Paper text:
Aminoglycoside phosphotransferases, APHs, catalyze the transfer of a phosphate to a hydroxyl group of the antibiotic. APH(2″)-IVa confers a high level of resistance in several Enterococcus strains towards various aminoglycosides that are prescribed in clinics, and it can use either ATP or GTP as phospho-donor.
We solved the structure at a resolution of 3.05 Å of APH(2″)-IVa in complex with G418 (geneticin), that has an intermediate affinity for APH(2″)-IVa. As already observed in the previous published structures, Glu235 stabilizes rings A and B of the aminoglycoside. Interestingly, the interaction between Glu238 and the ring A of aminoglycoside is maintained even if the substituent in the 6′-position of G418 is different. However, its interaction with ring B is, in turn, abolished. Similar to kanamycin A and tobramycin structures, ring C is maintained by an interaction with Asp197. In general, the APH(2″)-IVa ∙ G418 complex is characterized by less interactions than the binary complex with tobramycin, which may be at the origin of the weaker affinity of G418 compared to tobramycin. More importantly, the H-bond formed between Glu235 and 2′-OH of kanamycin A is replaced by a salt bridge with 2′-NH3+ of tobramycin or G418. Indeed, G418 has a weaker affinity for the apoprotein than gentamicin, with a secondary amine at C6′, and even weaker than sisomicin with a primary amine.
Numbering used by the authors: 2 to 297
The structure:
């Protein structure tokens, strides 16, 4: 699915006739949504497909709830679409947040003082977010990790039966068995997490040299809080392990060794996710890649 500018303008003007669009342009494009910037004050997201539509819904449902409870700015919901055909939510419109993504490059050009400060600021955020009371959220927001794995294991065998020989397939089973036999990946206290906590979603003020917002809650869910630290650890694309080590100290984490153990798993696991996401997105280059990494 893709949208023209006209199409988009119709969608909004329709449910919101007493709201005129002056400037519209594309702020960016994701795997689930295209993001349009309207009047320079708003980000409107349009889903590119049914699953994206569902994430959008959650992002909306979630931001409403945690609106005005966190240390840093997050987006505010202002405009909502309608369910329709296969899409649960047509589109949505959030307030724009001034800022630049705090890319790892940027991060290391800041003086050590502003670096140590951002560490402390993120820790505070993650800390608050993970404290929010989960008793009100409906069950479907609880991501059960053990189910996800089992579900994945099955999708894989379908998709790989006609790609792999007995002795190759037995290595995947071995791998999944080892994950599922390990209690550490599952025995956590669930809480609300961002679940895509990367640099691309951390906004930064070039004047003040301080973090000035957080932004994509499309994947947010009730899950293992360690996931919000792991997403920052990959060395090439995200911040260091060394930087994330500081966040953890201000967050006063009790089991850092466990978190690293989870990272190593997720990193290996990502191979399999490329295959799954690759087939349904479908990026065939994701699918070819994962198939080669697996063979190890
Ligand atoms: C719902 N969509 C999400 C989507 O947001 C995205 O998340 C990325 C994630 O892929 C990246 O992380 C992943 O992808 C990168 C790859 C793109 O270079 C790999 O280097 C890395 O090992 C892997 N963990 C991470 N660096 C940023 C997140 N925002 O990819 C995963 C996803 C589940 O499809």
């Amino acid at each position: 699915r893709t949208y023209t500018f006209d199409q988009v303008e119709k969608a909004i003007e329709q449910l919101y006739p007493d709201f005129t669009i002056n400037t519209i342009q594309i702020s960016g494009k994701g795997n689930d949504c295209i993001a349009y910037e309207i009047n320079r004050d708003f980000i409107f997201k349009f889903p590119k497909h049914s699953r994206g539509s569902t994430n959008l819904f959650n992002e909306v449902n979630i931001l409403k709830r945690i609106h005005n409870k966190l240390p840093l700015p997050i987006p505010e919901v202002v405009f909502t679409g309608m369910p329709s055909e296969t899409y649960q939510m047509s589109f949505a419109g959030f307030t724009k947040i001034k800022g630049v993504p705090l890319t790892p490059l940027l991060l290391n050009n800041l003086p050590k003082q502003s670096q140590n400060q951002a560490a402390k600021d993120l820790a505070r955020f993650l800390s608050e977010l993970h404290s929010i009371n989960i008793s009100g959220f409906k069950s479907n927001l609880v991501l059960d990790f053990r189910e996800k794995i089992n579900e994945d294991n099955k999708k894989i065998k379908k998709l790989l039966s006609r790609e792999l020989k007995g002795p190759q397939m037995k290595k995947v089973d071995d791998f999944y068995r080892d994950i599922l036999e390990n209690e550490i990946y599952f025995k956590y206290y669930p809480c609300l997490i961002h679940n895509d906590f990367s640099s691309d979603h951390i906004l930064f003020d070039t004047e003040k040299n301080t973090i000035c917002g957080i932004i994509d809650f499309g994947d947010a869910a009730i899950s293992d809080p360690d996931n919000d630290f792991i997403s920052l650890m990959e060395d090439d694309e995200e911040y260091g392990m060394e930087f994330v080590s500081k966040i953890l100290n201000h967050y006063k984490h009790k089991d850092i060794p466990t978190v690293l153990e989870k990272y190593r798993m997720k990193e290996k696991y990502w191979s399999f996710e490329k295959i799954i996401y690759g087939k349904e997105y479908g990026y065939m280059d994701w699918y070819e890649e994962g198939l080669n990494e697996i063979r190890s």
